[PDB]
Every structure is written in structure tokens, then in C-alpha cells.
Amino acid sequence: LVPRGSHMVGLIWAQATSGVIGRGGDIPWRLPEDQAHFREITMGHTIVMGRRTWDSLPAKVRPLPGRRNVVLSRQADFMASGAEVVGSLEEALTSPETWVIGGGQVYALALPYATRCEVTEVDIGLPREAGDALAPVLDETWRGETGEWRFSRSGLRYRLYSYHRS
Numbered sequence: 001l002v003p004r005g006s007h008m009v010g011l012i013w014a015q016a017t018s019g020v021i022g023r024g025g026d027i028p029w030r031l032p033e034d035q036a037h038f039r040e041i042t043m044g045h046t047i048v049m050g051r052r053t054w055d056s057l058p059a060k061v062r063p064l065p066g067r068r069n070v071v072l073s074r075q076a077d078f079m080a081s082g083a084e085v086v087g088s089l090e091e092a093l094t095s096p097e098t099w100v101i102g103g104g105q106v107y108a109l110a111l112p113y114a115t116r117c118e119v120t121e122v123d124i125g126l127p128r129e130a131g132d133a134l135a136p137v138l139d140e141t142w143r144g145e146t147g148e149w150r151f152s153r154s155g156l157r158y159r160l161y162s163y164h165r166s
């Protein structure tokens, strides 16, 4: 349970088995089961994303519905129509429950404050290339639950992990 006076911070991402989460300003696969899972977890909560992740959303879809959208930028003239832009995680993490939804820079930034991670791993063989955005690496303070491999309607295997720490 999440007491309303707390500030719970979770990270949620989908990665290939290599750790790649983004390339060329997009996610280099599509998995409908992961889209549904991402929405089930985040709906109703504040979502925090990096400026480059906001840029990756088509103008017609953003801000993402059903969730308070917060965008991190250091640029005083960057504006996100329909959403709030803030310059730090301290300013972004005011809600009782916040999901950090990417990308690679913002996961690394938020990791020291996070107590939950929800991961989808997609069994697509995408090697890491220079410039890719990557999932954060989780140290031994994190305890994980790994689901069995499942199979998507799209013909890719995937599995879910849930990590927690104190």
C-alpha cells in the first residue's frame, strides 16, 4: 500500500535482451502486450519522462491520457503543450506515487530514489549500438521476481520482471 504522505518512485521500461531500450528516437520493436501492461501499471498516476521521450511521442498523442504528465528538461525555453516541464527530479517527484517512464538518461537519474522497477524483456536479438538508450543496471540491493517466457500475438517471446528494494 502507498500512504498518501509518502513519495514512492517506480521505474518502468521495456528492453531487448541486450538492454537496448531506444534507438534513433524510437523504441526498435512493437509489442502490444507490453503497451497494455505499461498502461495498466501507470494509469491514474503521475508519469515522469525525459525531454527526448516527450519528443518521441507523436504530437497528436501527447500528453498521454489518464496520467499527470511531467517532462524533465534543462532548457528554459523547452515547452510541452498540455504537460508540465520541470528542471529536476526534486521538482518532479511531488506526488505520492510516481512512475518514471524513460528514457535512458532519466532512469539513471531516478534510480537512487526508486524502490520498484517493472521490466518487460523482449526476446528480440538487437545488439547494442553506439548512441542507443539502455536500461539501467540493477545492483544487489534490488530483489527481483522473473516471470516465465510468454509468447506475444506479434510472434515475439517476452517476460516480465518485478524488482523491489527498501
Ligand SMILES: NC(=O)c1ccc[n+]([C@@H]2O[C@H](COP(=O)([O-])OP(=O)(O)OC[C@H]3O[C@@H](n4cnc5c(N)ncnc54)[C@H](OP(=O)(O)O)[C@@H]3O)[C@@H](O)[C@H]2O)c1
Binding pocket: 012, 013, 014, 015, 020, 021, 022, 023, 024, 025, 026, 027, 049, 050, 051, 052, 053, 054, 056, 072, 073, 074, 075, 078, 086, 087, 088, 089, 101, 102, 103, 104, 105, 106, 107, 109, 133
Ligand atoms: N523501451 C522503453 O521502455 C522506453 C521508454 C522511454 C523511452 N524510450 C526510448 O529511449 C530514448 C530516449 O532516451 P534518452 O536517454 O535518449 O533520453 P531521455 O532520458 O528520455 O531524455 C533526456 C533528456 O532529459 C533531460 N534531462 C536529463 N537529465 C536531466 C536532469 N538532471 N535534469 C533535468 N533534465 C534532465 C534533458 O533534456 P534537455 O536536453 O531538454 O535539457 C535530456 O536531454 C528514445 O529512443 C525513446 O524512444 C524507451
Ligand SMILES: CCc1nc(N)nc(N)c1OCC1(COc2ccccc2CCC(=O)O)COC1
Binding pocket: 012, 013, 014, 027, 034, 035, 037, 038, 039, 049, 053, 057, 064, 065, 100, 101, 102, 118, 119, 120
Ligand atoms: C509501451 C512502451 C513502454 N513499455 C514499458 N514497459 N515501459 C515504458 N516506459 C514504455 O514506454 C512508454 C512510452 C512509449 O509508450 C508507447 C509506445 C508505443 C505504443 C504505445 C505506448 C503507450 C502509450 C500510453 O501509455 O498511452 C510513453 O513514453 C515512452
